[PDB]
């Protein structure tokens, strides 16, 4: 998985 951005 992961996320990260940056939003
Ligand atoms: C985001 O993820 C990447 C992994 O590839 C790290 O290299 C990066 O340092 C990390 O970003 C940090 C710094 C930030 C953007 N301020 C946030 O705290 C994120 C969660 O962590
Ligand atoms: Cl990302």
Request: no cysteine; net charge neutral.
């Amino acid at each position: 998985x992961x996320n990260x951005x940056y939003x």
